[PDB]
Amino acid sequence: PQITLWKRPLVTIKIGGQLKEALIDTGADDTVLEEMNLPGRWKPKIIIGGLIKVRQYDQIPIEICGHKAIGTVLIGPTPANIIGRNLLTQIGCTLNF
Amino acid sequence: PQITLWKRPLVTIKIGGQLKEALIDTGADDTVLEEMNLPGRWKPKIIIGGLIKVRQYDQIPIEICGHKAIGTVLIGPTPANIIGRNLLTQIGCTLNF
Structure with missing residues (x-):
């Protein structure tokens, strides 16, 4: 979409x-x-206040407005859900003006 | 551009x-x-570590890849230069996929 x-x-x-x-x-x-139940193994990661510990899951399937992609997702006490570039490239998201 | x-x-x-x-x-x-010399009056604002004080300048002319726009710019000890939505709407920047 646009x-x-x-x-x-x-x-x-x-x-x-x-x-x-x-x-x-x-x-x-x-x-x-934010915290949710994901299937699979994960690894520790340290990354909106100060440092927080989270769980790094790799090659997780996701879907953003249709568009099926896979990639790394950090799950944790994040103040807000954020879709970063690592996934934006996977759905072909671009900035246009 | 894209x-x-x-x-x-x-x-x-x-x-x-x-x-x-x-x-x-x-x-x-x-x-x-980040700190720079801008012409005009400004007002105090408190907003990457904890809180920092900055200077809010309004209706400042700016240019991003051509595209002349005007808007509010906060100047201060920001860890990095950031172009936010307040200006992105002014140059007609959109997300597309």
Whole structure:
């Protein structure tokens, strides 16, 4: 689709079978969602206040406005759901003007 | 233009006659640049570590890859130059996929 920036670009993402509202954030390298139940092994990662510990899951299937992609998702006490570039490149998201 | 997100979307902005590198950040409501000399009156604002004081200048002319726009610019000890939505809407920047 084509999203304008008059308001925060919040979209729906399907991950782990659940639907959620995340913010398309071109200024974020990574994707970090609030606590949820994901299947698989994960590894520790330390990354909105100070440092927080999160769980890094790799090659997780996700869906943003249709568009099926896979990639790394950090799950943790993030103040907000953020879709970063690591996933934005996977759905072919670009900035245009 | 059309910018892909394989790397951080850094662009050049002309403000106060000087050129600078800022990051197009759809996840940021406002625009905040590192200390520079801008003409005009400004007002105090408190907003990457904890809180920092900055100077809010309104209706400042700016230029991002051609495209002349005007808007509010926060100037201060920001860890990085950020072009927020407040200006992205003014140059007709959209997200597309």
